[PDB]
């Protein structure tokens, strides 16, 4: 191979940039439009190219809310990541005082490591992604509508317009791929823009629960 392996490290990186951009992190125009033949320049073929610590991202600051709110993306090399490698990434994350990270596992994650991500801390939140999910940006798939994470001042209008409580809205799971993509948590509301058969649009709403 080597032609195929670099293709993944370009497509995965490209999707993570669009994922970070859609979450509202500061992403530059040359990161999103990074071409395959341009990817070959900073990191080349597999002997020169390094997977565990060359392709890591940390430049992503939450430029809307605050430049100190920052997030990692990590690319482990072992297909099943143990707690040891998690603890390695956690203490590096502890030193930098960053509170969010993405871990991009290649085949899976061992069960005792998965349990750690639930309870390591509420103030140190890490999201597992399999790379096989990142080879295709699901927000550009033809069956997936536009999702828009609503602000609290807009949720308060939705519930006022219909005179609802929150627990009467339809539900969306936190384990949903598109919920994971936007990184939303319980009690956020997503606006969903379904396309009509005509030129028009229908607007619907869901509650994360």
């Amino acid at each position: 191979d080597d032609e195929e392996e670099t293709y993944r490290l370009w497509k995965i990186r490209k999707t993570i940039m669009q994922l970070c951009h859609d979450r509202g992190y500061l992403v530059t125009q040359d990161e999103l439009d990074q071409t395959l033949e341009e990817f070959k320049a900073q990191s080349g073929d597999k002997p020169s190219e390094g997977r565990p610590r060359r392709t890591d991202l940390t430049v992503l600051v939450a430029h809307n809310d605050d430049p100190t709110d920052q997030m990692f993306v990590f690319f482990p090399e072992e297909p099943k990541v143990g707690i040891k490698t998690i603890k390695v990434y956690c203490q590096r994350m502890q030193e930098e005082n960053i509170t969010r990270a993405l871990i991009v596992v290649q085949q899976g994650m061992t069960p005792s490591a998965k349990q750690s991500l639930v309870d390591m801390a509420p103030k140190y939140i890490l999201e597992q992604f399999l790379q096989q999910e990142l080879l295709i940006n699901i927000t550009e798939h033809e069956l997936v509508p536009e999702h828009v994470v609503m602000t609290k001042e807009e949720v308060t209008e939705l519930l006022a317009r219909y005179k609802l409580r929150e627990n009467q809205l339809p539900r969306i799971q936190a384990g949903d791929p598109v919920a994971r993509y936007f990184g939303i948590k319980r009690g956020q509301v997503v606006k969903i823009i379904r396309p009509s058969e005509t030129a028009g649009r229908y607007i619907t709403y869901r509650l994360v629960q």
């Binding site: 195929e4 096989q132 295709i136 550009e140 798939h141 069956l143 997936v144 339809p170 791929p177 598109v178």
Partner: protein, 248 residues
């Protein structure tokens, strides 16, 4: 053109080791005994598969009676040898007779859940383009092979679409698939009926069936639940839980 279709077809359609080997042989020598597999590299070169002897070493060593990487050698670009080891669990070292029927059925290339794939042809005068039909049950893998346009592949199965693309893509698949089945038998239904059915199936975030199990997750009322199926169990549970039933 078809030359590109057959490449990526060969990246999803399962091929077994026995399908690309011109023979497999046991060899007993005075100093050692082993099983040997010679790959038919002519047939590899035609079927456009990206496998060789060094890759077949990686197809083996996974889920095959804990065979060791050391025990598998790649003495030439066409040959592999699997030195048998004692299973040391409900078996005799003579486990070569297990491998001689099992080693061909290991998967060297492709997606394990795909039974077959076929190329399909359009007949319109304006164009000619080839779509690939996959009879199998791993949507995520087919969305991620090099050379499949992952943004426009679809599935019949609502459970696969839910697990891969979320509840709102599963909701559209219930609409598309019911409407497809109705149109083929010449029935017609206004879209607003199949729309409401799919929105009832997905409003709690999971695709719930119209079975007794799905209805027990949707409906709170004991007497509604007890007037369909499992009429005894729902009434004893309401007694245990002390549930009060809205007569609404």
């Amino acid at each position: 053109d078809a030359d590109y279709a057959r490449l990526v077809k060969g990246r999803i359609e399962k091929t077994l080791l026995g399908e690309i080997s011109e023979y497999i042989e046991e060899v007993f020598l005075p100093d050692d005994c082993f099983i040997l597999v010679k790959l038919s590299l002519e047939r590899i070169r035609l079927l456009r598969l990206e496998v060789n002897a060094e890759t077949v070493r990686y197809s083996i060593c996974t889920s095959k009676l804990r065979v060791k990487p050391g025990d598998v050698a790649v003495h030439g670009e066409a040959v592999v040898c699997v030195t048998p080891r004692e299973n040391s669990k409900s078996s005799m070292y003579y486990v070569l007779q297990f491998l001689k029927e099992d080693l061909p059925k290991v998967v060297v290339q492709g997606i394990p859940e795909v039974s077959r794939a076929v190329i399909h042809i359009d007949e319109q005068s304006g164009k000619e383009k080839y779509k690939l039909l996959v009879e199998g049950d791993n949507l995520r893998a087919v969305m991620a092979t090099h050379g499949v346009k992952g943004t426009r592949t679809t599935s019949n199965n609502t459970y696969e679409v839910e697990k891969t693309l979320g509840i709102e893509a599963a909701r559209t698949t219930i609409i598309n698939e019911i409407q497809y089945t109705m149109v083929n038998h010449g029935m017609s239904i206004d879209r607003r009926h199949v729309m409401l059915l799919s929105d009832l199936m997905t409003y709690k975030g999971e695709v719930l069936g119209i079975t007794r199990f799905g209805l027990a997750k949707m409906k709170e009322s004991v007497l509604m639940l007890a007037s369909f199926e499992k009429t005894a169990d729902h009434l004893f549970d309401a007694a245990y839980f002390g549930q009060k039933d809205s007569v609404c």
